[PDB]
Structures are given as structure tokens and as C-alpha cells.
Amino acid sequence: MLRVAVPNKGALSEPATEILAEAGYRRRTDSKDLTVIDPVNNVEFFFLRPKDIAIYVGSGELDFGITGRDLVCDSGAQVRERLALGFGSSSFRYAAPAGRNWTTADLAGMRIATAYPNLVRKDLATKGIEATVIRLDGAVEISVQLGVADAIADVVGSGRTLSQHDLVAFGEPLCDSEAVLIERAGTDGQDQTEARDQLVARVQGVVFGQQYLMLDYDCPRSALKKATAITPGLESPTIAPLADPDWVAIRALVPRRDVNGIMDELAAIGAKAILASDIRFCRF
Amino acid sequence: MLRVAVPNKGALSEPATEILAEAGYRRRTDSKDLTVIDPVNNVEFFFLRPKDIAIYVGSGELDFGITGRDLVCDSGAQVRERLALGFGSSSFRYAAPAGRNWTTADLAGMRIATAYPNLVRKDLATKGIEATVIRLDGAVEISVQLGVADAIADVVGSGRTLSQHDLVAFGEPLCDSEAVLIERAGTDGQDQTEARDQLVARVQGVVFGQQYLMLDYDCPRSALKKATAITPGLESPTIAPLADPDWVAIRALVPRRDVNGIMDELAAIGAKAILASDIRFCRF
Amino acid sequence: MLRVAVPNKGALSEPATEILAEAGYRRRTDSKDLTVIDPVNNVEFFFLRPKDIAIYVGSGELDFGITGRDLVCDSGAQVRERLALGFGSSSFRYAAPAGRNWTTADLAGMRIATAYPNLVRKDLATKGIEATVIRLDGAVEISVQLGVADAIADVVGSGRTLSQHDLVAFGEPLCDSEAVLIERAGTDGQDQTEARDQLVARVQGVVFGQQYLMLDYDCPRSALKKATAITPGLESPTIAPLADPDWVAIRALVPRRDVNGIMDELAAIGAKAILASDIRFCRF
Amino acid sequence: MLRVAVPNKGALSEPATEILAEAGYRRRTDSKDLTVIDPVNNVEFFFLRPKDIAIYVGSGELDFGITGRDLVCDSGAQVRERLALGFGSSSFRYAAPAGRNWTTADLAGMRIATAYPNLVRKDLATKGIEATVIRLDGAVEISVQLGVADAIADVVGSGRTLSQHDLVAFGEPLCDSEAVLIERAGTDGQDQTEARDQLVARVQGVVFGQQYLMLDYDCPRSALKKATAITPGLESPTIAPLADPDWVAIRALVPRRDVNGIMDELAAIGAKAILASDIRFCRF
Amino acid sequence: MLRVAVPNKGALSEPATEILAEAGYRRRTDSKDLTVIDPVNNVEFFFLRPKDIAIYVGSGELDFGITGRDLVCDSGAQVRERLALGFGSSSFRYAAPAGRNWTTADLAGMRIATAYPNLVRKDLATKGIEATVIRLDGAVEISVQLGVADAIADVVGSGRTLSQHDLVAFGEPLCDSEAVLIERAGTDGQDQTEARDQLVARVQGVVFGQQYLMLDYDCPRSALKKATAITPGLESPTIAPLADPDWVAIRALVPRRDVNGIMDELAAIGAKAILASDIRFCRF
Amino acid sequence: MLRVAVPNKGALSEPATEILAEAGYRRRTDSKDLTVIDPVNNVEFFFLRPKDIAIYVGSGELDFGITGRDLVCDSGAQVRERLALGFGSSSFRYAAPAGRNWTTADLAGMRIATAYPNLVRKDLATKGIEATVIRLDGAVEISVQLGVADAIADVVGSGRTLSQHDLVAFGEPLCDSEAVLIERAGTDGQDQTEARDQLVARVQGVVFGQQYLMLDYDCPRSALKKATAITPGLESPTIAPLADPDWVAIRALVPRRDVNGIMDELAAIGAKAILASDIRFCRF
Ligand SMILES: N[C@@H](Cc1cccs1)C(=O)O
Ligand SMILES: N[C@@H](Cc1cccs1)C(=O)O
Ligand SMILES: N[C@@H](Cc1cccs1)C(=O)O
Ligand SMILES: N[C@@H](Cc1cccs1)C(=O)O
Ligand SMILES: N[C@@H](Cc1cccs1)C(=O)O
Ligand SMILES: N[C@@H](Cc1cccs1)C(=O)O
């Protein structure tokens, strides 16, 4: 029996449930209750505060959790990062009032406000800089105008929040906010390592599969050799006859980021009825 | 022209609309209005109180409805149950205050509170027990603490509601709450039996299809005979060549409940890029 | 870099975002913010008032927009209508109090209230009729009871709003409300015509694809010739062997509106496990 | 320690809590939890389904409840109606399809649908009429169009629901829906009758007080005798000097329904700065 | 029977209903339905689109309405403004991109976007300036960035919307947005002028009363002459004895804007227990 | 110009705004924006995270804030507590799994989870106990079941959260959660101490006033001496004649907690029409 922590609120909550459903796990009946038991797969899901999930995996009885990479950095927990999940990512920056030409060495001896004080203290220490790091609960950008800090450190999305408070980012970026699957650092026994590997393999099937689309298209046999070079697939394109003996249908996986270039090439050699559909799971 | 009753509220409402959409019927424009007309399919949908749907089908002009099995038991209506739909299911139990070792024969001469008094009276009568059944509108669990009843009878989900009021279930379970497609018990004419059968066949396509996934995978020709035995499909696996002449692609339906065992077997004999995707409709 | 206007509210807003996602464009992170930048595809999306989108495309810097056809008629903007999108459609009618036998020539010299005064004035002028057209902001049906107009002109959905105010429609219908992709009437340069055509082709892939389903079914080789005539596909049916040498699997696109007739024919000649699945994109 | 049932939902819920607050009882912290304990006043409040409150008072351990008069009629409970509360009132009528000249004797042998079957059966029996009364859970007006009943019986607010389904009311009105304070029919002991009377007196202070306004106005001593006859107050007007020796200020309770006529009379005899303010509690 | 138009949505809707309730009119049962009938006071209330209310009063059958002053300016309706209501007020300004030193004469021949085109055209014409005024449905501030206009004209609240789009206001302010009670310009008959005056007098009682507070305080008789000069009241302070013969209690209306200065003066001469309470109605 | 921090969310937010409105300060226009400027009173209000308000007052530029007493204890800020506000109060307890007879000395060397780690560490240190205090973001009660802690420390409301997780409180209570007005520990200048004192006096007027009701009643002159002893008021009862020379009206403040006992005594000596009304402000 495995126990998995899922964010119960915020930007990571819906895509975390979506990726667990695509891996075949029982979805949450309604947002009211806070555990979901999966008797088929032998897993229990707990819906917890996002900033706490790393502590529950690192110090508690949870085998796995989904949370942001910056929250793992800030927590001090000793856990394994098994997979980057492909959502929630955003840079983490220092920032200070615009029009002042701020640089990293200006931070020495200043007051820096953040919701991630352990992350920031470790970053400054590696760069050999000492400063006063002030813990806040959230929404730190207003703290400069209000006189609590000289500068801030926060997740920056597209700069809306920095711009709306006349702040500009500077310095090297810190630990980012991409969603990750984390695992407790342990060994336990043999009959537990197997059950753990099964979950990682299933989540990995979604993480990998979601990078591709299936192309299906009708192709003249005369353009077949060209078509095969344009869509070589993960192993090799599938080729099946049509009723019309001068034609075939071809099936091949293609990366989502390549799809529009690929289709233009196929049209130019005679391909017709080019279909593209989402992949939600693929065990390579 | 057919008339179909759909629950307008509660746990059955969204999955009932979802199953009707997957059968190809026009979905509700917005939750405000309470009828949807489908000119293409020649069907009108009425969104009604769930506890009333069995009476509208049994005594009214509706040909079909979707409702819970326990609500059909409680209604006294004479209707046909054509399909179990695969959602909404939960046990229906007697319960009484914890720590008292309650048994079914303890009910004789007691006061029993329930929102389903006809269901409970028929159940007691079959077991040869007489008691005072008190009709309540809902949320019956608090009625013991408040002195209206000695015991209750209700849908139990996972026991959250029983536990939160210090109640424990006992006795044989009663008529459960699984969602069902019900039909009016009739004959009408010939030109009406045909239109009725068409709807049942389409809903059945969803009920059956939703139990499977399509597996698509690349396989070495040397492991082909093993692969065929692992995924025999509904009739027989589809086999198509790849461009690489030492390989094929195989397509076969597999039950959702078997999928993870199946994939492990395929990987161990050489299969690569194992894809799995939802089936939403299949006419066997 | 292209700029595209999307309705931010109302009946057109969700299906407009859905069609842009199926064409492969980055979906809106949350309904709070009002621009979404797509660095991959090199497009910026602006979420604007629906009644204003035609003016932003016609007079502003936007290359494209999605809006209702009646709003383009009312705006006076000079834009190209490139695609009808297949949603949001509804008739646009004159209406007047029930039980009075109203005809178009009764409008001469009357007061007509509408939220689309330019559309109505142009319609009357073409028919050679003069009247006083009163601009209102919305919900015009109550304006007769309240004495501001003798008749109205409005989008009629199914007549709920007309019926609920005792109004009946008359006369030839006006410019309807179907959703359309509009483009700025221009030429600009060469490197801009190409980027524009790419977007139209991708949206067209969704508009075309969404009219079909993929049928997949197992078929005896003895019924193969009949099967090919029943599902001829967009080019020609795909045919692949099963493991069982007396059988094949057939794949063919079929129009959604034909699907249930088609499947009945296939069952009657021996076809088994008839699958149907949505198409979300097809470049013909 | 007293126990009081308050509707947890619907049209009676907010004004019931408002009247209990004005009587000085602790208000509900938030709509989530379902009991509120008042240690000061020694009362516990339970927030229950409105249709069940009469059964909890009549058969359970609750001393008091607030509910509709029609729900008491339908419940069959033996409880005392102590106060009419002055809100929630509406007529209860039979109704049948418009344009048919329906009368009470037309009900004999017909099918009548209602959410209050015990109320309706008792009403028919008193009039010497037999019919088939069909219990429905709610929203009964659509049941005629759908073929379950020939006529209905329901609370009619202003006829919106009857009109929107082409129904017209007929016959003598039944038990109405005015909110009432009900009490368990009992005697218990001496130390319980006292605590019960205290609550009734406090609620009665609100019910009585809310029928009046306090008038405060400056008046010339020459118009004093006229003023006293216009506002005689509950006992006699209060009269106090102003600094200016030719003037006084007068205070008197006046019924809300009389206030505007009263003020016009006072202005016409010289009164100035006529103030009116709500009364929320008055023990006569 | 009078008919009154109330905004059904937006910033004016709640304070408009609040002022009508304090004048003693029946409040809206729930936001669903769109008329409220007051049989006691013989008035019917219609809840309409705010931008349309001036047209319903000016051209329709409504006797009164509550709307913004700028909406009356933009409508072209001929109505009487009877009372300024004391809420909703905000300036109406031209604005253009920051850092450009814009002045009113820069508008000549430019494109100006606004939701109030008739208001703006009349303002420009009075100043002897010609320009192209572009009607938009709302949210006009983004129209400069998007290339539809050179400048805008809009209600400015505190400049949040101008600042968030890098716009700065210039020129003389236009017709503002303060809420007003408007009346149809007419004469009708005698028995209608009376009913109209009654409503204006009652609303005026709230508009006037809401500018004051009632002060009630205990005062030594030795400081009485000073106290009378500090709070002279609307006519003259009320003076009543306390039980203690060296003391009195004084009651006087004071303007809300003066209250804190007044109380400081009273404390310094010996006044104790200084009470202040809201006035909701006063007929002077 | 003063700056005041108000909680923007949670249980303290609405009563904090209510108490500031009753002191005469401008209320927040809508929950969207996060500052409100009061030009009349010369105060700016900032709506901030509750757990941060003590840091903004202690280290920032804010003169005042409203927050919980436990949050001041946990923050380490050096601020003055000027007033207890009379809402939000609740005990703060240690707790551990039920049925184990837990005592304070059992905490030594254990793991204790809390959202208020500084408060808990200082409490343990004063009692001479060492333990491992684990910071969590919220909802700490589940942390025992999940293996992160042996015991917890949290605000307990009525024990719902402890009971729902099978925890029981033990030991002496810690710093509680009552709402307080806090002030920055400073001196600044002379012209700033005055403006600060004015705000404290106005909030104190609400805190004091809200503990009383005004009684107004008609009394026979023969029962006057008894009446004066029953309601002596804050200074002495107000006495005014009625028109009827055998009667007077009496006005006196009485504590809310005494009111029902007082009224019973007044009725028994002949008092009639006993009115009671809320006090929202009183400067003693
Ligand atoms: N044969 C193609 C498509 C696939 C069929 C089955 C799995 S992948 C490929 O390898 O990409
Ligand atoms: N031939 C495979 C897969 C299918 C293709 C078409 C329908 S089912 C089977 O029977 O399971
Ligand atoms: N060959 C079939 C099905 C398709 C396969 C690939 C594209 S369309 C057809 O043309 O309809
Ligand atoms: N004396 C007046 C007003 C009141 C003063 C106190 C109670 S009622 C009356 O009897 O109406
Ligand atoms: N006599 C005082 C207070 C009032 C008593 C009644 C009306 S106004 C004044 O004129 O202000
Ligand atoms: N004179 C009474 C009532 C009051 C009148 C004015 C202030 S307090 C008292 O001191 O309680």
C-alpha cells in the first residue's frame, strides 16, 4: 500500500490530478474530502498544503509527492527527485526598485524579504554574501514600498507582479518552480521497491507520451520513400494498404514541437487527410 | 420523438450527461434551462429532480430515464431496468449507535428513519420484521442523536457520514445506488419499439466500450506469436508491417482492469512504444 | 508576430478558446489576465469585448479575430470572413406583440429597438422602408411593454425570450450570429501573408476535422467488398490483416451526421467491434 | 438547556437567523457547521432541513423550531404554534391548465401532484372529495405537461411558476406558508416551562417591535396639543424642552404602515426635522 | 401607480436599492426576478441595464429612474434631474499616452475612443474642436496600445486603469458619474403630480438625513451654556434632566463631517458618555 | 498621514472592517483592490496577509494594524498592544492522540508540529522543556497520522478539528487568538503622537460602546424611585415627562450581558414598552 501527496490548492493542483488520472489512478470524487483510496492500484492519495508536501515525504510516511522544485529547495528535506513533470515552471529571481542599476553584490548587508528564506539563505551563502533574510507568508512584492525590505526574492511568472510594483529582476536565477515527482530517500525492503518502481514507470509513461502526437495520413505509394524519411516514428512508420492499390496509410509518432513543419513537408509530396491526435500514455 | 429524463442535480447529473454525449446526443447548452431538444436524433431531454425520475417514466410520458437503483426500488414504479451504467454505486445499509452490538432482529418494534421509506418497509416485510418507519427529507444520520429514531437506513459512501455521527452499519445490504437506464414498461406500437431499441443500443455502446482500452505497440516479428497470445483482442489482433521488415505494429482491445499486467508481459518479450488510449464507444 | 482577438465573455468565449487549443495554440492560463503570448507559434492573443472585436481587426493592429457574424454586420468594419466555425449560430428576427398579424411593411414609420442599430438600418434601407431605430445596450424584449418601441430586432435562440415577453417573430431573417474567423483586409508584405495563411490553415484543420469520426472495425474477408462500399473514407479505406486469416480490420473517416446509419449497415453484413472516435484535426 | 431547530437552506433561512439575532441570541459563525451553542443564554441551535423541522419538534428532543405553516400542516406532528413571524408568507393553491374553467368538484377521481400530499389529502377529505394524490419531491408544475397528473397543488408566490407553465389557480386556498415559531406539546416540569417562556417572550419582542418606527421631531409649543393627538404613542408621547423656550421635542412609536400619513399631518402643523428609525425589539 | 427603474448590475445597483429601502420601499426578494411590486406604496420597480435607464424614463412609461449623471448626458434624453444621491461619483477625463505633454487642442483631427460618444461629441463641439469619435462597448483604455485611437475619454476612478495602461489625463473634466434621481419631463395630470412629489420627498428624506448623526451626551448643568453653542442642532438642542439634579442629557443633530471636532470640544468642557448614531431619514 | 494594516482574508477580515467603519473610516469599495485612501480622516488602509501584519507594523512604515494576539506572539515583533477588540478569540493548545493520558512533561525530546514555531519554542523554553519544533504551513492536525510529529500545537476553536482527527488537548493554554489593535513602538515627533491618539480614541469608542445597549421605557411616576435603582445608567438615567402627567420616559445605558435580567425587573414594577437598541459608538 503506497501513500502519495497531491497539492490541494493553487496552480499545481489541477495538472497534478490530471497527470495522475492519465496514469490510470482513481480521480478525486469531489474537492470536499481530502483522501482518495484506490483499491485497484493499492494506493492512497492525500491532498495537502503545497508548501508542506516535501516535509511529509521527507520526514513522514508518504512514499511520493508532487510539488514545486523551489519548495523542495526551501524545505531542507532529503528526498529523491524522480521526474520533471512538464508544467508549472517559472523563474525565481531577486528584484529591487526600478531605475537604480541593481547588481548581486548590492545585496550585502541588506534586508531581503521572501516566502522561501532557506532557499535564499543557501543561495547567498554559496555566492559568499551575507544579508538579513526576512520570512514573509506571501505576496512579498509590496514589502519594499512598505519599508520592511530593500529587495525581494520570488517566483516571477511573466513579470506582471514585478511591473505592477515597479520592481526589476537582477542576478543569476535561483531554483525554479517546475513541478516534480519526489520520492522518499530510503530502501525499506524488496516488496516495497517493486511497488514504488511501478508508480514511477506509469507516471513516466505520461511524461514521455505527452511530448508526442500520432500522425495518420493517406500517401501515394510513389511518395512512400520520401514519406518514410519525413516521419521515421519512434521505431519505424506503420504502413498499411488502402483498398485503392496505388495508395497506403502511414502511422508514426512525431514530437509536438515538430508537427507543423512535418505536415507542410508531407503535403508537398502528395500526402492527403493528415490527422494528428494527442498521446496521453506511452511506455517506450 | 422520444423523451428522456436526466437528473438535474447531485452526484448522478454530470456522469449522466457525459454518457449521453458519448452516445452522440446533443449536450445541454447551459444549466439554466431545463429541456434540450435534439432535432438530429429526434429526442427531447428533460432535466428533473432525481427522486422523481422513476415516477415520470413509470406513470408519465417519458420513454427513458437515468436514475439510481435505490430510487427505483423506493418509487414503486413499474419500469424496465435495461442497463447498469457503471457509476454512482454505493451500498445501502441499516445503522445504529456504535458500541452496542446491533443485529437485524433488534429492529423489531423500533423507530427507523430514512429518506427511502417504501424501500425499507418492503425489505423489513420480506425478512418478517415489523417496525415504525419514519419518512425524512434527507440527512437522516443526526436523527438518532436528536431522538426521532433508534436506527437509520441510508446510502453509505465510505462511512464518512456514519463515522462523523458515531454510527455503525449492520445487517444484509439493501438495494444499492448504482446508476441505471430505465425504460417504461409498455408495447405501444411497432414504429416506437424501433426508435427505443436504437437508443438502448447507443447507450450500450458506451457502457461496453468504456470497459476497454486500445493498445498499440511496435513488436519484433520474432516475438509475434507470443504477443498474439498476450493480446488476443476482441476478435483477433490487427497486424501491420513497419517500414523495417523485421518489425510489425499490433493493435488490440484490452480490458482496463488488465492493462498494467498486460504491458509488463509485452515489455519482457521485446515490445516497444506501448500506447494505451481510452475507448468511448464500441458496438460489439 | 501575429495578434488575435478572442471574446473574453459570453456564449462564444469557451468554444473559441477550445478551437484555438485544438489548432495547437497555447491556452489561457487563467481568466484573470487578458493577454496570452505563444512564443512557440509566434502569436499573441488578446481577450476583448465581443462587440468590439470587429473594430479592433478592421481599424486596429489585430490580424485576426473570432466573433459573431451579426456583430461584423453591425460594426461597419471592412474585414474578410475567412471561415465559418460551426458554433454559436442562431437566427436574427424582427418581433412584435403576439396576436396582431404583423408583417414587414407594418414597420414603416414605427419605433424599433435593438442592440444592433446599424445592422437593422441597413436591412430596412435595402427593403425600401424608413423607420426610427432606437439603440439599446441589451435585453431589448422588455422595451415594448415599457413603451420605448413598437417592435424589436434581436438574436432569437429558441424563442424562450420572445415567448417569455409575449412576442412573435415575423419577416425575412437578418444576418445571423454564427461564429466566424475574420481577417484584416490588407496586403502588408510578403513575409506577413505567409504567417497569416499558416493560422488560417490550422484553424481550417479543426473546422474540417470536427465534421468527421474515425470508424475502426473488424470485418470478415467475405464481407470486404460490401464494407468498402459502405465506408469509402476520405481517399480509400485502410485494410490490415488480423492474426486470424479469415478476417481484416478496416479504418475509414465518416461524417458525424451519417455515423448511425453507417454502423447499422456494417452490423448487417457481419462487422464486429465497431469503434468510433472524435477527430479534432485533419489537413485534407 | 434548550434546543432550537433553524432552517439550514431556502427562503426562510436568513430571516429566521435575523429574527433570532435581534432577540439577542448568538449568530451562526459560518454556514459550514450545523450547530451553534449559546453558553450565555443556555440554548443550542441546530440547522436542519426545513421539511423535517416539524418532525424534530413533534417527535424528537427539540423544544422549538421555525418553519412554514404549510410544512406543519403536511407533517402530521402535534406541536403548538406560538407566534406568526411576519415573513415567508404566500398562498397555497390548486391549479390546472389554463382555458378550461376548472372548479373544485372537477378534482374528484383525478390525479393531483404535490410535494405536500398529507396536507392535500386532509383538505380534500374535509370537502368530501376523493382523488389520487401523487407525492413528488419538488417542482411539481411540469408534471401536467409530462402526463403524471391532471392538476397540482403548490405554494404560489406571485404566479410566476404557474404562468411559466400555463397553469391557473382555482378553489379555496389551503394552509399557507407563513413562518411560525412552533413548540413541542408537553409539560415536562416547572424548571423547564420557565426557560421556554423566556424564549417566547424574547422572540415576541422582535415580532411586536418590528411593526413600529420611532418618530422624533421638533415641534412649536403652540402646535403641541395637535401634535399629541396625531402621535399618541404606545402609552403617551414623550415631551422634552429645547433650549429655545418656544419649542419642544416629541418622541412616539407609530406603526410602520401609518408613518407617511402621520408625517404629512405633522408638517402641516409646523413640525420640523421629522426623524424615523427602525425598532428591532419592544417588550410591551 | 408609479414605475421606477433601478440599475440591475454594476457599482450603482446595491446603493440604489439601499437608498430605496431607507425611504421605506419594498426591497427586492432575490436578484433572479426583474420586477418588484409594492402594493402598499403603489409603486412598481423594474431592474434594467444602467446605460438604458435614461431612455426608459425619457421615451418610455417610467416616471423615475436612478442612474449616473454621465449616462444621462450621453443618452440625449429630456428628463429632469431632481436629486443628487451622494454616491457613485467620479471624474470623467480625456487621456493619452504618458510622457507627451498632451493638451486639449491636440485632439483636433484625432481619433478618440469612448463608451460615451454623444457626451464626447457635444463636449468637443462646445470647445470648437472637430475630431473622429469612435464608439466602443467598454474597457476603452487598451484601444490606444491596439491602434484604434490616439486618445480616450472615460470615467476615471482613482487612476488605476489609466496607470495600468500608461495613460495620463488632461483637459477640463467632463460630465461626472454621480448617481442622480431623474424624472420624466411632463405634466400629465393633477392626481399624478401628487404621487410623484411624494416619492421625491421620501428619497429626499434619505439624501438629507444621511448627511447627519445624532449626538446624545450627559452634561453638567454648569457647562450647559457652552454645550448649547457647540451643538446647536437643526432647530435647537433637546435638554432633559437626569435623576442627578446637577446634570442633564442633550440631543442634537450634527453633520457627519464635523463630528470628531465637535466631540473633542464637548469632552473639554465636561461632557460624558458621548454617543453618536446614524440617521437614515429626516424630513426637514 | 497614517497607515493602517487590515487582514485581507480569513476570520478576522470582516469584523476588522466592521469595527473600522463604526469608528467612522471609509470602507473598502470592493475586495479586488488592496488599498483604500481616506482623504477626510487622513489615513490609508492596506489589506495584507494576516500572518504578516505584525512584521509590517514592527519593522515597516505602518503605524497600526489589526491582527490576532497569537500572531503577534509568533512574529517576534516589538509593537504595543493598545486594545483588545472583542472578537476572534479562541484557545491555543497542545494536543496528542486520544487515549494515552498525555501531560506536558511527555513533550520532552518529542517532535511537535505547528504553524507558530516561535510561539511554541518560547513557551517550552519558559517551562524548561526541550523538544523538536517542526514548522508547517497550516492544517497541522493530520501530521500525527502521517508520521511527521508526535503531538501538535494549534488554535482550537470548539474542538471540531481535534475531534475529527482523534486528538485531545492537554497542558496549560498558550497565547490566544483574540483580535488586537497593535501600534508601532516609537516616539517619532509631537505632530505624530496626536494623530495616533485620535485613532486609538475612536476605535476605543467602538470597543467600549459595543458592550452596552440603550434601554428606553415608559414608567409610572410611582415606580420611578425603584426604576432609577434598576437602571442607574453610565452617569444617571435620563427622565422626561410624557403628555400623561402620571408617567415619564426613562433612558439609560445597560451592559448587554445584563439586559434580560434588567427588563424582567422593570416589567414587575410597572414599566411598559421596554425598548432596547444597539450602541455602536460611545466616548466615555
Ligand atoms: N510504427 C509507428 C507508430 C506506432 C505504432 C504503435 C506504436 S508507435 C512508430 O514507431 O512511431
Ligand atoms: N483487431 C483488434 C483491434 C480492433 C480493430 C478494430 C476493432 S477492434 C481486435 O479485435 O481487438
Ligand atoms: N484510409 C482511410 C482512413 C484514414 C487513414 C489516414 C487518414 S484517413 C481514409 O482515407 O478515410
Ligand atoms: N413615550 C412614547 C415613546 C416611548 C419612549 C419609551 C418607550 S416608548 C410612547 O409611549 O410611544
Ligand atoms: N432638538 C435637536 C435634536 C432633534 C430632536 C428631534 C428632531 S432633531 C435638534 O433640533 O437637532
Ligand atoms: N442618562 C443616561 C442615558 C444617556 C443619555 C446620553 C448619554 S448616556 C445615562 O447616563 O446612561
Author numbering:
A (entry chain A), B (entry chain A), C (entry chain A), D (entry chain A), E (entry chain A), F (entry chain A): 1 to 284
Copied sentences from the primary study:
Many of these FL-regulated enzymes present in pathogenic bacteria, such as the ATP-PRT from Mycobacterium tuberculosis, are essential and have been proposed as attractive targets for antibacterial drug discovery. Because of the common FL fold and functional similarity, the regulatory domain of ATP-PRT has also been associated with the aspartate kinase, chorismate mutase and TyrA (ACT) superfamily. Activation and inhibition of ATP-PRT leads to the same overall conformational tightening of the hexamer. Our data suggest that there is not direct correlation between R- and T-states and active and inactive conformations in ATP-PRT.
This strategy led us to the discovery of 3-(2-Thienyl-l-alanine) (TIH) as a non-essential activator of M. tuberculosis ATP-PRT. We confirmed the identity of TIH by calculating the anomalous scattering difference map for a data set of the complex collected at 1.8 Å, which exhibited positive density for the sulphur in the thiophenyl moiety and allowed unambiguous assignment of the correct orientation of the ring. In the ATP-PRT/l-His complex D216 interacts with the l-His side chain via a water molecule-mediated H-bond to ND1, but in the complex with TIH the water molecule is missing and its position occupied by one of two observed conformations for the D216 side chain which is oriented towards the thiophenyl ring. Addition of either l-His or TIH shifted the equilibrium towards shorter drift times (44.1 and 44.2 ms, respectively), characteristic of the T-state.
